[PDB]
Amino acid sequence: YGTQIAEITAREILDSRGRPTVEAEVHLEDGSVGLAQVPSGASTGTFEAHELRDDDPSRYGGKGVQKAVENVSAIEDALIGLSALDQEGLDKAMIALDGTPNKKNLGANAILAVSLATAHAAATSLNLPLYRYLGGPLANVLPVPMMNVINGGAHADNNVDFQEFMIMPVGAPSFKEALRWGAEVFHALAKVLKDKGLATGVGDEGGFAPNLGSNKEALELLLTAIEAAGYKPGEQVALAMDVASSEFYKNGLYTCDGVSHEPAGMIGILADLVSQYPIVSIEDGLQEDDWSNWKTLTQQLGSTVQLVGDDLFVTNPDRLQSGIEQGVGNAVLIKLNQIGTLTETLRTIDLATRSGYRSVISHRSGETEDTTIADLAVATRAGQIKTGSLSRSERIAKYNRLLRIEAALGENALYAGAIGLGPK
Amino acid sequence: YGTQIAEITAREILDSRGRPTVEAEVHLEDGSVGLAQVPSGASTGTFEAHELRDDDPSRYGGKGVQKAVENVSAIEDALIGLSALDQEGLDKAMIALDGTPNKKNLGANAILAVSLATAHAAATSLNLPLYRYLGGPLANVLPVPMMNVINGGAHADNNVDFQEFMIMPVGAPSFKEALRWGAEVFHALAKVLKDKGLATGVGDEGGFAPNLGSNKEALELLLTAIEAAGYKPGEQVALAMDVASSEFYKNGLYTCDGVSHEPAGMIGILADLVSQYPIVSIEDGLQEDDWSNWKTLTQQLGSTVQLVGDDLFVTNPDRLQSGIEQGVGNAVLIKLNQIGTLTETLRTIDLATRSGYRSVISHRSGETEDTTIADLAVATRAGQIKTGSLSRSERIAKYNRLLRIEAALGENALYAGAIGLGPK
Amino acid sequence: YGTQIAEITAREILDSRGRPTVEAEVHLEDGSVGLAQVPSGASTGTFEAHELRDDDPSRYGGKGVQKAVENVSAIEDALIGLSALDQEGLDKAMIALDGTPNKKNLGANAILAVSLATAHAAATSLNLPLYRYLGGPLANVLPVPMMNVINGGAHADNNVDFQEFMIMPVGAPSFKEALRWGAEVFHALAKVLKDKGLATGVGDEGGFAPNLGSNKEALELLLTAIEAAGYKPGEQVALAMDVASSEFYKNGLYTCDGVSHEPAGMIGILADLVSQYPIVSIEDGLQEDDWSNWKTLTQQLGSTVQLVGDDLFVTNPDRLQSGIEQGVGNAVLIKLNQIGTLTETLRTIDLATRSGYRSVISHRSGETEDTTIADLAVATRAGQIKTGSLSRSERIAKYNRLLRIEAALGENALYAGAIGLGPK
Amino acid sequence: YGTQIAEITAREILDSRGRPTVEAEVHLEDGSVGLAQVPSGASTGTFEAHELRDDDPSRYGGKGVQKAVENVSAIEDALIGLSALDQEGLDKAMIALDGTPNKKNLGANAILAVSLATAHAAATSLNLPLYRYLGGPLANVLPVPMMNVINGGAHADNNVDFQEFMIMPVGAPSFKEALRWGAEVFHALAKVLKDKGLATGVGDEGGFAPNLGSNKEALELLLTAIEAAGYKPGEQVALAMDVASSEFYKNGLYTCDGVSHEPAGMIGILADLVSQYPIVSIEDGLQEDDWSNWKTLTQQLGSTVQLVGDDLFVTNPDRLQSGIEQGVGNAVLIKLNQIGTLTETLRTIDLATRSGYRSVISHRSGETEDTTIADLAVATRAGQIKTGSLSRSERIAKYNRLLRIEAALGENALYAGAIGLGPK
Ligand SMILES: [Ca+2]
Ligand SMILES: [Ca+2]
Ligand SMILES: [Ca+2]
Ligand SMILES: [Ca+2]
Ligand SMILES: [Ca+2]
Ligand SMILES: [Ca+2]
Ligand SMILES: [Ca+2]
Ligand SMILES: [Ca+2]
Ligand SMILES: [Ca+2]
Ligand SMILES: [Ca+2]
Ligand SMILES: [Ca+2]
Ligand SMILES: [Ca+2]
Ligand SMILES: [Ca+2]
Ligand SMILES: [Ca+2]
Ligand SMILES: [Ca+2]
Ligand SMILES: [Ca+2]
């Protein structure tokens, strides 16, 4: 009786950008409480779960989530009495209650909040940490963090075309050391920016967006930072990029460093960059619908560098399955609130894993104090996590959770970067 | 037996600025776990508790806290077996174990981590929320938030002399509405900055530090933002300032807007500002040791505006007691890690309260996902909290906790701004 | 305290062939009991865990396991007090206690018995079925059974060169239906043998070994049986083979149907067979050390048919990792007692899964009433199990366990054959 | 309240021959679960309980048990709320619910499955092993096993007229040693068959059915096997036979070794065999209805050899009572599913015991992984069990249970063969 759902509550809280989002609280008959918060999503997109916004222009600029919060009342009616242990039954019950493919009815934000809060409730009921609850006794791999430090494209006011430049401490012996390497490189980077008179205000993810002139300037900055912190680029701290090519793709052409390129040109740009720079991963190097050219990119660089689909796959098992069939990418970003249940997320990670694709567990721009993605990364042995820079506690709280997990695993703790489960 | 301490653990985590800090975990014989994290402090200052840094230049730029974390082992030896309910006994036991006035030996960061983790453990043991555990059945007052939005002085690269400009939703019917008013003003402010081509990268506290020319420009910006969001300055959303005058005080002179002033000049500047602008509070308007001139400032503006000591008092009961005796200030910033135990913090709030001074429960620059100061504010009916802007979840998590508290108090929930426990 | 190991006992029992083996019984402080039995292994082989036999010629023809049973006393000394939940810690503790690479000291049979009995104890402690304990909330896939029906080579007295001919109900909607299809084909086969005056006594695995003249005769018999039971060969019931080529390989030559072949000849034989017959899988088609020719076989048939390494890999993560690197096989037989702990078995299945190899969970010739491999198959979503024919309850008990698992998963039950996790 | 029946479930599983049978699962209010499986029975016979088959020719060749499984739903309605401790009340409730003498309505297979599952549930509730639950504190006697090794008559394709030839380790000091003697004789027998070029495929019970010419050849084979294993025939390992004379009885005549005999001839054949060979027991030596001649056989050999009724009595208390009255046999085979409840089985064993008849607890041809008959043998101090050869785990699992029972009884363990409760 004890694991049966007794109560499900939701309220409107704020994310890390000061915008409404949903949290849910699940009480079991044995007194177990699970609390989960949902990050910022999208209300739009063919292959993405739709979060429900109120669109009331006189509240929170129409970004209220009173309707999603009210819909949790209808989920409570449907789920009261079910075992919290039956995650798949619970998730299927909410999918059917919603009855729409993109969860437009109840809201993805309502459904995911209950989906995670149930899982937290159930792990507390069994007195298991969430990573062990979800992953069983081999859930022992700390991910290589891909750590935001420089922003461009739509995430900046500068002449950098690519969206995110990241460091990855691939060479560290432990997550605890990997995190310290990240932080020291981030503080060395701050000092270099100050010394060059560049702005050191941070953006959504806790990284810098100084007024730089090119993608090259960004990569050169990260190399200076790594070396000033005393680490070896590539061997110890490698580079990664979110190209978000969709942002600068118009009519079969990609505009990059003032010039227009055909797919074959953009591919060549990416190939020159991985030649010149210790880049171990590239996300959305080509546009979300440029599949024939994605196939060439994968054929050419796929065995030498990670090729992450984000907008390419939108955590959608049909798009990922198509990618797998066509030799497109070798890695996929996993966003819980892009698909909308824990079950469907785990199915999508399993599909990636079985096909030799790497799963990169990802934050959203609008994050919360929730640390679920840390446990999700360890549960699935994903080997990588993307949860922002080395400032802002909606980013830092995931690393602190990973430190607690690594300590608790003790002598069983493995670091992905040391056992071949990293990007390279 | 159940509330007796069974285990006390600590580890090195990261704060919101990517710098090491301490968290402690307290296990009771009944299985109750309390976890607390400590914000960034100071290793220096006569009247402040000293946090212990490792000063190992090859780790975290010498800001490691391995020694503080190890000292928690010596606290566990001292406290194992004591009831977690006896907060004062526990806090006195750590003070004696340290045996130094400024907690230099064990570290303030080690002592406060155990002090809070014990209190969280004890409230969980009794199944009470922390605010009720600490404050008893009248702990029912949601504080007026003083919300960072514009930064100057040592917290910016601009020509603004004052350190912090804040909004305070004094006129809201509830904390839930007060928080929405704050967020809408913050998003209107962002839009005004973008439209004027000013930088919108955020600093430590989640506010903006655009290149403005004067304190006046800052105040005019907040008024535009308030009005653009559709609120009435003063009646609905009032202004507050952290002058941090210590930063621009040299030899009995205060340099402010290009000119040098004698105390009487600086006082006059403050008096003109509260005349022209709906400023309901001023922090560190005069230097931390300028007591005769503090007495004049208090005599002149004290009955018309809140005068907050921060550097003036450093949460120190002797300095506060001196202030009370001399008619200096009418409000005090309360920083847990400036004094170093929960007991001594509560004594200092009681001393302020009994003497008609307002307590403003304060964050630090280096914050964590910890939400203790939200419960501390409600427990003591402090009526005000200062926990940063409307972005970064080390700030936002305190407001989300206050939303959970307000919901749980239900029909017993009171907002300080509506019942005369605010700044004005 | 409750999951802590209180007692570990072992005794000498009999396997399905009337030969000694080990069972272990683990008691937890909360009264949870786990019991496991180990199947027949080998005392020999470079890359295999060594089971410990007594070699006392006056007992059980020297196949006694009194020494392995006594060694469990030394494991109890090492493990008493450890949480049964910490499977990896427990397994590593026994590996270190043994201190030999092939577990020659304590015995693989002693170590695996405690390894499984601990896992059963822990799942009972948490009140979870073993598949859910090991696999988490997505452990919902019933495997396609590869069902022994005709034996040749070293497992018969006949002129059939290949060792095992199997049916696989790939086309069934459920494991419950798949099992019925298997049983009906097996009873139709028995009738065909009786009607042709061929022997219907069964061997170790519960299949037939009639005096047939060729591999072709075996395949033609299974096709008659399938059709007489009213099923469609390939679409509904497909064929699989254990070639065990090591048995008829001498000096770079394979003797098959009276003729000697070079690797390229044997490959051609296999290619003609998959052309003529609905064969969806081939095990040990080439010799255990014939790696260059394995590479050709995989290159030629790998995308059209499953190529299972058994003697090729001996459930050894180094041999499997080599195979993966060299494009050798696309599937691996998983034998718990070939590696000797549950942890190392799960690591080996994870390694196969991540590299796009299929895991086939396998019985041994000497089996017991233990049903662990059924739960192991569902826990890891392996998608295939090889646990003998449709007679002898050491084989049938695994299918009865799979029926209990499918019933308990309810609407969440998936059949590997219907969702693309089968051989084809 | 705790021993009250909360739930009774059944499902269709497979027996050791790949044919459907029933298992039932009984849950008590205290969480106790009992699971039992039923062996193959008969749907026909005047004095036998009728198992219910579906007779649907398109499923399992009409041997489905969906109807029996559904009838367990009607038993659950009748029994929910009754104490599982009240075995007799439960068994009488099912007998009345069925309302037919041969349990044709619900099915013997449905009724016995619930009857055993209840008893297992109740013993688990009291934390007693089943033998102690049923037999009280003197349940301490391990039976002499009668172990199948050679088959003839309707159970073979050969010229052996008698149906079963068995060894019985009457001279062993313990069941643990008795089992080893059995296994060593069985492995010596296998070797003799291989060396003579005779088939070593096994039948239903895990024994051999080589193409032998006579009953004499069978007896001579067992003597060679016993001696080759190094044991003394008679003193250490004795012989037993299932004549199943009904199979070769037509019109007052018994055809045996090519000749027709009158009852007095068949009796003489049996008398010569016990003269020449160390035969300690004979089952169905004369036809199931040949009572006057059974009386002569018993008068002549009864004080020198065990005379077991199987088809003679069909575990029926009226036929056994008639036998007792007429001096027919001195032993009875006990088959749970021939009578259909545990209560009626125990009544029938009590009736045999009180009248000086030996009870031989018997398997069926279609057996399962269930081990109830091992506990039944020890509970009733029956002193003999007939549960097949030394291969196939539906046979071996009963011996493994007897090993667990003997270990658990410790210094209180008695072997029937050593204390005069055996066949001789
Ligand atoms: Ca529990
Ligand atoms: Ca730009
Ligand atoms: Ca992206
Ligand atoms: Ca270590
Ligand atoms: Ca309590
Ligand atoms: Ca300045
Ligand atoms: Ca200040
Ligand atoms: Ca109200
Ligand atoms: Ca438990
Ligand atoms: Ca042969
Ligand atoms: Ca094989
Ligand atoms: Ca269904
Ligand atoms: Ca009890
Ligand atoms: Ca015959
Ligand atoms: Ca018989
Ligand atoms: Ca003894």
Residues constituting chain A = 424
A14 with B60: Cβ contact below 8 A = no
Which among C202, C393, C399 has CB closest to D394?
Answer: C393
The minimum CA-CA distance between D424 and chain C, rounded to whole Å, is 26
Give the residue among B306, B351, B333, B245 at the shortest CA–CA distance from B298. B306
End-to-end CA distance of chain A: 47
Which among A37, A199, A403 has CB closest to B199?
Answer: A199
B74 phi/psi in degrees, rounded to 5: -70, -35
Asked whether A266 and A300 are in contact (CB, 8 A), the reply is no
Sign of CA dihedral C419, C421, C423, C424: positive
Chains C and A touch (3+ CB pairs under 8 A): yes
What is the distance in A from the centroid of ligand 5 to the CA of C72? 42
Amino acid at C378: V
Which among C60, C369, C390 has CB closest to D183?
Answer: C60
Give the residue among A333, A310, A364, A161 at the shortest CA–CA distance from A249. A161
Q: Which residues of A touch B392 (CB under 8 A)?
A: 16, 392-394
Q: Is D48 annotated to bind ligand?
A: no
Q: How far apart are CA D83 and CA D30, in angstroms?
A: 11
Asked whether B156 and A200 are in contact (CB, 8 A), the reply is no
Give the C-alpha distances (Å, rounded to integers) separating C238 from B115, C280, C384, C395, C418. 68, 6, 13, 20, 14
Which among D18, D61, D201 has CB closest to C203?
Answer: D201
Chains B and D touch (3+ CB pairs under 8 A): no
Catalytic member of A51, A205, A247, A344:
A205
Give bridge partners of residue D306 from the DSSP assignment.
D281
Asked whether C319 and C312 are in contact (CB, 8 A), the reply is yes
Beta strand residue intervals within D48-114, DSSP E: none
Q: How far apart are CA C284 and CA B166, in angstroms?
A: 75
Q: How far apart are CA D31 and CA D6, in angstroms?
A: 9
Give the residue among A416, A368, A417, A412 at the shortest CA–CA distance from A113. A368
Q: Up-side HSE of residue D220: CA atoms within 13 Å toward CB?
A: 7
The minimum CA-CA distance between C321 and chain A, rounded to whole Å, is 12
Element (H or E) spanning D25, and its range?
Answer: strand D20-28
| Number of C-beta neighbours around residue A6 at 10 A | 18
What is the distance in A from the centroid of ligand 6 to the CA of B154? 7
Q: Is D295 annotated to bind ligand?
A: no
Give the residue among C210, C206, C186, C209 at the shortest CA–CA distance from C198. C210
Both tokens of D51, joined, read: 């198992």
End-to-end CA distance of chain C: 47
**Cα-Cα-Cα-Cα dihedral of D101, D107, D108, D114, to 10°?**
-120
Q: Note the maximum CA span of chain B.
A: 66
The minimum CA-CA distance between C119 and chain A, rounded to whole Å, is 10
A13 with B209: Cβ contact below 8 A = no
Provide the angle, in degrees to the nearest 10, between the axes of the packed helices B317-325 and B342-354: 10
| Number of C-beta neighbours around residue D128 at 10 A | 14
The minimum CA-CA distance between C291 and chain D, rounded to whole Å, is 36
Q: Which residues of C touch D391 (CB under 8 A)?
A: 16-18
Element (H or E) spanning C14, and its range?
Answer: strand C5-14
Strand-by-strand arrangement of the B33-37 sheet:
B5-14, B20-28, B33-37
Q: How far apart are CA B121 and CA B36, in angstroms?
A: 10
Which among A18, A179, A184 has CB closest to B186?
Answer: A18
Q: Which residues of D touch C37 (CB under 8 A)?
A: 400
A16 with B396: Cβ contact below 8 A = yes
3-state helix, strand, coil in chain B (%, to 5): 45, 20, 40
**Cα-Cα-Cα-Cα dihedral of C216, C217, C219, C224, to 10°?**
140
Q: How far apart are CA B392 and CA A204, in angstroms?
A: 8
Q: How far apart are CA D120 and CA D346, in angstroms?
A: 15
Q: Which residues of C touch D396 (CB under 8 A)?
A: 14-16, 18, 368-369, 394
Find all residues with CB under 8 Å of B123, minimum gap 6, and list them: B34, B129, B130, B132, B133, B134
Give the residue among A423, A364, A366, A369 at the shortest CA–CA distance from A401. A369
D16 with C367: Cβ contact below 8 A = no
Asked whether A324 and C324 are in contact (CB, 8 A), the reply is no
Residue with tokens 């570990």: C8
What is the distance in A from the centroid of ligand 4 to the CA of A174? 10
Is A253 strand, coil or helix? coil
Strand-by-strand arrangement of the D5-14 sheet:
D5-14, D20-28, D33-37
Q: Are strands B141-142 and B33-37 parallel, antiparallel or unpaired?
A: unpaired
Give the residue among A99, A109, A117, A91 at the shortest CA–CA distance from A35. A117
Q: Up-side HSE of residue C277: CA atoms within 13 Å toward CB?
A: 28
User: How remote is the C-alpha of A13 from its chain's centroid?
Assistant: 21
Q: What resolution, expressed in A, was reported for this entry?
A: 2.0
Q: How far apart are CA B86 and CA D333, in angstroms?
A: 74
C88 with A346: Cβ contact below 8 A = no
C92 with A379: Cβ contact below 8 A = no
R_g of chain A, CA atoms, integer Å = 21
Enter the DSSP assignment of B52.
P
B110 phi/psi in degrees, rounded to 5: -65, -50
**Cα-Cα-Cα-Cα dihedral of A285, A288, A290, A291, to 10°?**
100
| Number of C-beta neighbours around residue D228 at 10 A | 16
End-to-end CA distance of chain D: 47
Both tokens of A325, joined, read: 């069939």
- What domains are there in chain B, each with its CATH number? 4-127 (3.30.390.10), 128-424 (3.20.20.120)
Residue A305, exposed/middle/buried by CB under 10 A (0-12, 13-18, 19+)? buried
Asked whether A147 and A363 are in contact (CB, 8 A), the reply is no
Q: Up-side HSE of residue A191: CA atoms within 13 Å toward CB?
A: 13
D392 with C396: Cβ contact below 8 A = no
Give bridge partners of residue A142 from the DSSP assignment.
A415
C390 with D18: Cβ contact below 8 A = yes
What is the distance in A from the centroid of ligand 5 to the CA of B30? 8
B415 phi/psi in degrees, rounded to 5: -100, 125
Q: Tell me whether residue B205 is one of the annotated catalytic residues.
A: yes
Give bridge partners of residue C333 from the DSSP assignment.
C360
Q: Is B326 annotated to bind ligand?
A: no
Residues with CB under 5 A from ligand 3 (ion): A 242, 310
Chain A interface test: which of C4, C30, C88, C357 (most A C-beta within 10 Å): C88
Chain B interface test: which of A369, A372, A389 (most B C-beta within 10 Å): A369
Size of interface A-B (CB pairs under 8 A): 127
∠ CA(A146), CA(A152), CA(A154), 5° rounding? 110
Both tokens of C110, joined, read: 């002693």
Residue with tokens 């952290």: B242
Give the residue among A303, A240, A320, A231 at the shortest CA–CA distance from A277. A240
Q: How far apart are CA A97 and CA A91, in angstroms?
A: 10
Q: How far apart are CA B419 and CA B413, in angstroms?
A: 11
Q: Which residues of A176-199 are buried (b: 16+ CB within 10 A; e: fewer)?
A: bebbbbbbbbbbbbbebbeeeebb
Enter the DSSP assignment of D247.
G
Asked whether D108 and D21 are in contact (CB, 8 A), the reply is no
What is the distance in A from the centroid of ligand 15 to the CA of D310? 5
